[PDB]
Design a protein around this ligand. Structure first.
Ligand SMILES: *[C@@H]1O[C@H](CO)[C@@H](O[C@@H]2O[C@H](CO)[C@@H](O)[C@H](O)[C@H]2NC(C)=O)[C@H](O)[C@H]1NC(C)=O
Ligand SMILES: *[C@@H]1O[C@H](CO)[C@@H](O[C@@H]2O[C@H](CO)[C@@H](O)[C@H](O)[C@H]2NC(C)=O)[C@H](O)[C@H]1NC(C)=O
Ligand SMILES: *[C@@H]1O[C@H](CO)[C@@H](O[C@@H]2O[C@H](CO)[C@@H](O)[C@H](O)[C@H]2NC(C)=O)[C@H](O)[C@H]1NC(C)=O
Ligand SMILES: *[C@@H]1O[C@H](CO)[C@@H](O[C@@H]2O[C@H](CO)[C@@H](O)[C@H](O)[C@H]2NC(C)=O)[C@H](O)[C@H]1NC(C)=O
Ligand SMILES: *[C@@H]1O[C@H](CO)[C@@H](O)[C@H](O)[C@H]1NC(C)=O
Ligand SMILES: *[C@@H]1O[C@H](CO)[C@@H](O)[C@H](O)[C@H]1NC(C)=O
Lengths: 98, 290, 49, 48
């Protein structure tokens, strides 16, 4: 008990469901991160290739082996707001660039 | 000097030389390099620091063949080399024909340490086109060998005496092309984990697996093939099992719009290679570099 | 000024299995049922159930 | 030149500066708090 090699795979694969992009976390194939997912067809994967990387070293795509599908990863939103405030005012004027 | 258990003491002779080949490792074509573990690069140049040969060192033929009697010097250096930091192997597929039926068998590789039964030994063994890779507590015999299925010999293959199945960390089966000419293998370890790469046909090498062991491996060994074999007294045949060491070096690889390597250049071979690696391009511009 | 930047939930976990499955239900649902006098025994190890 | 400067400034987030990794997610979820402080401090010093 709680030793050896034979174990139970029931506390790791619980959800087994990928959303349509809600800026969720992931711990895929050892590498972890956060982002949204988007369904995009891909025909460049192979039998031993499941992840897509760029020249910089980030994650771009991901192939799920339990469903034989390919998704792309988009970064989450992290920006600031420009607030113009006068001398005596109640609420400043907000601006979200782009 | 492989195992520490007596399994057989029959047909044990004393002595009956690694054939150094004149060819060198070729680069800028794809041979020698390998794909990433599971990462894909499309239409880009990547400067990757990995484990590769240096300039095309000479190979060593470690293939051992026996007919009736075995030898004691075979289980000793320089036949039992040292797995310093990596091994790149090139195997020749021995294609035999019996009753208009094709068969393909070759040697068996065992990497690890002494490991009578204390630590794991990673053994890759071929079975008529099925590569079985197992990392367990296999007990190596004092004189192991491997017989061939087609045209069997008079001895019996027995390299482990484990009556009960011991604990294992990775046991898997892979399928390769049974009508291939050459096979390529790439083994190395880093940060405590051991990687594997194989290639049945093609210039680059494909990914096999990565296993966490925690300990540093010591030696690798190719088991002999005591069977109806390369001995040309009846049928002509040739076996070539070349092995070359590895080294931590930085290469520059290219990927087209599909994801297959077209050419790969070094960075410590010629003066132009250094410029190509500094500019990260195969056709650098005009200028004066240091 | 900055925003909220809440913490995401519902993590996604994926990993390739190293050892194959045990497949005990295949032997438990065999076409032949042994007699109580035989009580055939089978050992399973280095697998995932 | 401006694009190269921006890319070089962005690429600094993938360096370790002596730490076990370059991402805090696998640092705060693998080791205990009282021993990752030095790694976080080294990362902060490098980025600053
Ligand atoms: C995902 O696609 C691959 C490739 O089409 C499938 O692998 C095939 O599986 C069948 C049935 O086991 C075999 O006959 C083929 O030889 C396999 N092809 C290759 C290239 O390996 C795989 O089964 C698919 N997975 C799922 C869950 O549908
Ligand atoms: C592990 O290996 C050792 C030898 O490497 C085994 O010891 C042998 O055990 C058999 C059976 O009792 C004896 O006949 C041999 O003489 C032993 N060899 C030596 C060198 O003493 C041992 O049984 C193996 N298993 C364990 C659990 O230790
Ligand atoms: C990998 O292939 C080998 C050989 O095809 C398999 O070994 C066979 O296992 C079955 C079941 O125990 C035996 O009935 C056969 O006699 C074995 N063959 C040989 C040549 O020994 C092995 O089980 C395969 N491994 C996996 C994980 O599928
Ligand atoms: C691979 O990358 C090269 C380098 O960017 C691409 O070549 C450029 O393609 C764009 C159009 O996509 C042209 O406007 C540029 O003039 C091209 N530059 C050069 C130097 O050729 C090439 O198209 C890419 N291949 C793909 C995407 O399949
Ligand atoms: C294994 O059992 C767990 C426990 O309910 C379940 O969530 C999971 O889907 C099962 N896995 C498979 C492959 O059936
Ligand atoms: C095996 O190699 C032969 C000769 O190159 C080729 O004709 C055949 O298509 C190959 N088979 C596979 C499955 O790659």
């Amino acid at each position: 008990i709680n030793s050896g090699t034979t174990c139970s795979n029931d506390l790791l694969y619980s959800n087994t469901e990928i959303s349509t992009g809600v800026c969720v976390n992931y711990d895929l194939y050892g590498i972890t991160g956060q982002g949204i997912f988007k369904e995009v067809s891909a025909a460049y994967y192979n039998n031993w290739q499941n992840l897509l990387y760029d020249s910089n070293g980030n994650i771009i795509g991901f192939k799920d082996f339990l469903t034989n599908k390919t998704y792309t990863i988009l970064p989450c939103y992290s920006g600031r707001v420009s607030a113009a405030f006068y001398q005596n005012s109640s609420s400043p004027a907000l601006l979200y660039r782009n | 000097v492989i195992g520490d258990f007596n399994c057989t003491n029959s047909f044990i002779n004393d002595y009956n030389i690694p054939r150094i080949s004149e060819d060198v490792v070729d680069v800028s074509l794809g041979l020698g390099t390998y794909y990433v573990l599971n990462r894909v690069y499309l239409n880009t140049t990547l400067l990757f620091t990995g484990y590769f040969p240096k300039s095309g060192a000479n190979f060593r033929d470690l293939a051992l063949k026996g007919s009736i009697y075995l030898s004691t010097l075979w289980y000793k250096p320089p036949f039992l080399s040292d797995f310093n930091n990596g091994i790149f192997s090139k195997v020749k597929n021995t294609k035999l024909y019996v009753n208009n039926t094709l068969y393909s068998e070759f040697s068996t590789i065992v990497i690890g340490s002494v490991f009578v039964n204390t630590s794991y030994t990673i053994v890759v063994q071929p079975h008529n086109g099925i590569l079985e890779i197992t990392a367990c507590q296999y007990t190596m015999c004092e004189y192991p060998h491997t017989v061939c299925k087609s045209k069997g010999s008079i001895r019996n293959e027995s390299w482990h005496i484990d009556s009960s199945e011991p604990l294992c960390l990775f046991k898997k089966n892979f399928t390769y092309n049974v009508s291939a000419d050459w096979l390529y293998f790439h083994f190395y370890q880093e940060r405590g984990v051991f990687y594997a790469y194989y290639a049945d046909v093609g210039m680059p090498t494909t990914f096999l697996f990565s296993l966490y062991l925690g300990t540093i491996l010591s030696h690798y060994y190719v088991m002999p093939l005591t069977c109806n074999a390369i001995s040309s007294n009846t049928d002509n045949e040739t076996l070539e099992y070349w092995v070359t060491p590895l080294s931590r070096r930085q290469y520059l690889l290219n990927f087209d719009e599909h994801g297959v390597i077209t050419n790969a250049v070094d960075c410590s071979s010629s003066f132009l290679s250094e410029i190509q690696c500094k500019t990260q391009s195969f056709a650098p511009n005009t200028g004066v570099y240091d | 000024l900055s925003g909220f930047t809440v913490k995401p939930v519902a993590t996604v976990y994926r990993r390739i299995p190293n050892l194959p499955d045990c497949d005990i239900d295949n032997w438990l649902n065999n076409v032949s049922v042994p007699s109580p006098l035989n009580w055939e025994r089978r050992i399973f190890s280095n697998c995932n159930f | 030149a401006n694009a190269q400067a921006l890319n070089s400034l962005l690429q600094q987030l993938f360096n370790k500066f002596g730490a076990i990794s370059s991402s805090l997610q696998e640092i705060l979820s693998r080791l205990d708090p009282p021993e990752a402080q030095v790694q976080i401090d080294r990362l902060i010093n490098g980025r600053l």
